[PDB]
Design a protein around this ligand. Structure first.
Ligand SMILES: *[C@@](=[N])([C][C])[N][C][C][C][C]([N])C([O])=O
Length: 275
């Protein structure tokens, strides 16, 4: 029953249409869809092959350029699964194949139908003891409330998010009571507004680069602490910090191509503890 304990992961293959048609907050370089396919296969390979997780791998839909970012379509807590209503109208038909696959895992599904409420999963931080929900261009106040009710079991608190990002675009959990946090002003501000709002003090793992604050933390059997982090070729100074976490089974994972379209590590799966 440890924080980070998982048995299944839900992942979705990226469509060829992601190369040219995936939403991306800024203009960047060309997407090597092949390279992004490799990088995705290596991501899924760690979770399933190396870490023993049962992986649910959904088929790529071409008409949904962003289908590979499954995090944004669902939020799982305990045995309940909140099916979101993404900020991006064009992204809502990913809900459908995720819904149907969460049904095969026997999860308690609650759907966000409220035509006014929006929520991207990436805007949701779950520390194990409460919820922090980002308010952004993808997630609204009304979306936060529906989440607050689905999991009445947990305290929800909201924090304001800048630019064209998610809350987890600069943070995530690095272990039980350890939030990975970016060094930027925007990230520090966010964290401090989160700190004041809880009846608990979280330890902080501060890293130079905000994007590299987005890692995946798992507590898998016989292994203990496991952490997938952005590779040293990508963010060397951030990898330096993780490297110090000695009781953690550090796995470097590349996400350079998908990053072009604002894809980070957490975005690409939904983690599930089936007891
Ligand atoms: C991750 N959860 C970051 C918080 N989601 C990134 C989604 C990127 C995608 N291209 C989109 O929705 O625009």
């Amino acid at each position: 029953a440890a924080f980070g304990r998982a048995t299944h992961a839900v992942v979705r293959a990226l469509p060829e249409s992601l190369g040219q048609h995936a939403l991306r907050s800024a203009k960047g370089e060309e997407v090597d869809v092949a390279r992004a396919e490799r990088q995705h296969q290596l991501y899924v390979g760690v979770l399933g092959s190396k870490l023993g997780l049962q992986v649910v791998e959904l088929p790529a839909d071409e008409s949904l350029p962003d289908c590979v970012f499954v995090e944004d379509v669902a939020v799982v807590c305990e045995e309940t699964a909140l099916i979101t209503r993404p900020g991006a109208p064009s992204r809502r038909k990913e809900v459908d194949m995720m819904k149907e696959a969460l049904e095969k895992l026997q999860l308690n599904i609650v759907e966000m139908k409220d035509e006014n409420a929006t929520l991207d999963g990436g805007d949701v931080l779950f520390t194990g003891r409460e919820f922090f929900v980002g308010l952004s261009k993808r997630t609204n106040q009304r979306g936060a409330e529906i989440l607050a009710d689905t999991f009445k079991d947990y305290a929800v608190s909201t924090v304001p998010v800048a630019d064209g990002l998610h809350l987890k675009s600069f943070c995530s959990m690095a272990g039980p009571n350890l939030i990975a946090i970016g060094s930027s002003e925007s990230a520090q501000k966010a964290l401090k507004i989160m700190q004041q709002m809880s009846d608990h003090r979280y330890d902080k793992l501060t890293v130079p680069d905000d994007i590299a604050a987005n890692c995946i933390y798992l507590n898998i059997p016989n292994k203990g602490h496991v952490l997938l982090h952005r590779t040293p070729e990508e963010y060397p100074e951030s990898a330096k910090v993780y490297e110090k976490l000695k009781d953690h089974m550090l796995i470097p994972v590349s996400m350079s191509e998908l990053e072009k379209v604002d894809g980070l590590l957490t975005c690409c799966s939904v983690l599930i503890n089936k007891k």
